[PDB]
A paper describes a structure:
As a model β-strand mediated PPI, we use the GKAP/SHANK-PDZ50 which, plays a role in the organization of synaptic protein complexes and has been linked to several neuronal disorders. There are >250 [name] domains with several therapeutically relevant proteins known to exhibit their function through a [name] mediated interaction. Class I [name] domains bind to consensus sequences with a Thr/Ser in the -2 position from the C-terminus, with the C-terminus hydrophobic residue and free carboxylate being the main determinants of affinity. Here, we used dynamic ligation screening to identify peptide-fragment hybrids linked through an acylhydrazone bond, that are able to functionally mimic a β-strand and inhibit its PPI using GKAP/[name] [name] as a model interaction.
Interestingly, the most potent hybrids formed from 3 and 4 contained the same carboxylic acid functionalized aromatic aldehyde fragments (A047 and A048), indicating that these types of fragments might play an important role in binding. In all hybrids, the hydrazone bond existed in an E configuration with the aromatic ring of the fragment co-planar with the hydrazone. Although this leads to slight uncertainty about the exact location of the fragments, we hypothesize that the key carboxylic acid moiety moves dynamically across a positively charged patch formed by R679, R736 and R743 on the protein surface, making transient charge-reinforced hydrogen-bonding and cation–π interactions which is also consistent with a more favourable entropy of interaction. To provide support for the hypothesis that the hybrids target the cationic patch on the surface of [name], we performed molecular dynamics simulations on the [name]-compound 3-A048 complex using the crystal structure as a starting point. Over the course of three repeats of 200 ns, the aromatic carboxylate of the fragment indeed moves across the surface of the [name] protein, making transient contacts with R679, R736 and R743, as well as intramolecular interaction onto the arginine in the peptide ligand to a lesser extent (see: ESI, Movie S1†). The distance between the carboxylate and these residues plotted against time over the course of the simulations further indicates that the aromatic carboxylate is able to make transient non-covalent contacts in turn with each of the positively charged side-chains of the three arginine residues with a preference for R736.
Author numbering: 651 to 681, 689 to 758
């Protein structure tokens, strides 16, 4: 609008179940910190394997990670989030947000 940006924020919470011999099918990457609509979390999905577990559940490149297995990760560093995901083994429940104009 004439007074500032307009955009849509879409929240997605998904349950990922994978087999032992595969990954969840995404690459996590990290971008004193206050979340903003243009920068809602420290970790985001740099890529998502088309047809992989995460893709089939509805996760997409560019999604920002808000929660992992009931723990908020908005302000959590990359290595700690990786450990939280691995702690769940073949199960990952994650909330993400995707921002678009
Ligand atoms: C995890 O594998 C996601 C991809 C990723 O994190 N790649 N990291 C690249 C990188 C790390 C450090 C430096 C540097 O010190 O200049 C450059 C690039």
């Amino acid at each position: 609008g004439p007074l500032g940006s307009d955009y849509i924020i879409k929240e997605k919470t998904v349950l990922l179940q994978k087999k032992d011999s595969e990954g969840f099918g995404f690459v996590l990457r990290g971008a004193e910190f206050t979340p903003t609509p243009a920068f809602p979390a420290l970790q985001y999905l740099e890529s998502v394997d088309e047809g992989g577990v995460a893709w089939r559940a509805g996760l997409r490149m560019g999604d920002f990670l808000i929660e992992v297995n009931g723990q908020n990760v908005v302000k959590v560093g990359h290595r700690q989030v990786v450990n939280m995901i691995r702690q769940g083994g073949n199960t990952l429940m994650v909330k993400v947000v995707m921002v678009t104009r």
